[PDB]
C-alpha cells in the first residue's frame, strides 16, 4: 500500500497546490496514518527522505507531519542518513532550518537503528561546521555528542567550540558537547545532559519495532 501513497505525493509535490487537479491533503493523511501504524521500510524511508529534502511544492505543515511520523519499521540505511545530512545548512537546494531541526532530532531518535552508525563519523565536519547556526544548534549538539570519537576531537575543533561558547555568551548545549570533548582531553576547562528528546516517540517506535520479533 505505502508505495502507491508515496507515488501520489511525489507526483503532487512537483506541482504548485494552485495547479493540482485534486488536493493532496487526504493522501498526506493516509500516508501519515499508515506511517504511524506500520512505520516505513528501508526502501520507503529513502523515497520519503527524497520528498522531505528536495525542493518541491509540498507545504511545510505536511512535511513536518511526515517527519514526525517517520517511524522505521526495520533499520535505517546509509543512503537515508546521508540524504538528511546533505540537506543541512544554507543553500537554495536545502529545506527550512525548522525542518532541519526535526531531521537532526530524528537522527538522534533512530541512532540505534542505523545500519552503519559510523557513517556519521565520516561527515563529522559537515555537522560541526554548522554549530554557528543557532536555529539548529541544540539538535546538532545532541547528535554530535552521540557521534564524537577521539579522532574527531582535534585542537582546531576544541578551540572553535571554546570560541563559540565565549562569543555566544555561554550556551548549555555547547557546554554539553564540550563535556564530551572533555571526556577525551580532560585538560579542557568547562549544563545540558541530552536526554531523549521525545519519550512518547521512543515508546511508539519501540512498539513498531517489537513486531519484528
Numbering used by the authors: 8 to 197, 205 to 227
Publication excerpt:
As the core subunits of the CCAN, CENP-H, CENP-I and CENP-K (also known as Mcm16/Ctf3/Mcm22 in Saccharomyces cerevisiae and Fta3/Mis6/Sim4 in Schizosaccharomyces pombe) assemble into a ternary complex and are essential for the integrity of the kinetochore. At the inner layer, a number of centromere proteins form a network termed CCAN (the constitutive centromere-associated network) that binds to the centromere throughout the cell cycle. We here determined the crystal structures of CENP-I N-terminus alone from Chaetomium thermophilum and its complex with CENP-H/K from Thielavia terrestris, and verified the identified interactions. CENP-I integrates into the CENP-H/K complex by binding to the C-terminus of CENP-H, leading to formation of the ternary complex in which CENP-H is sandwiched between CENP-K and CENP-I. Our sequence comparisons and mutational analyses showed that this architecture of the CENP–H/I/K complex is conserved in human.
Instead, we found that CENP-I from another fungi C. thermophilum (ct) is 62% identical in sequence to thCENP-I, and showed excellent biochemical behavior. Due to the high degree of sequence similarity, we tested whether ctCENP-I could form a hybrid complex with thCENP-H/K for crystallization. It has been shown that the N-terminal region of hsCENP-I is necessary and sufficient for interacting with hsCENP-H/K. We therefore purified the corresponding N-terminal region of ctCENP-I (ctCENP-INT), which indeed formed a stable hybrid complex with the thCENP-H/K proteins. We first determined the structure of ctCENP-INT at 2.3Å with the Single-wavelength Anomalous Dispersion (SAD) method. ctCENP-INT adopts the HEAT repeat fold containing five pairs of helixes α1–α10. A following helix α11 folds back and packs against the HEAT repeat with extensive hydrophobic interactions, which likely contributes to the protein stability. The structure of ctCENP-I is similar to a model of hsCENP-I proposed previously, except that helix α11 packs on the surface of the HEAT repeat in our structure. The structure of ctCENP-INT in the complex is very similar to the apo state.
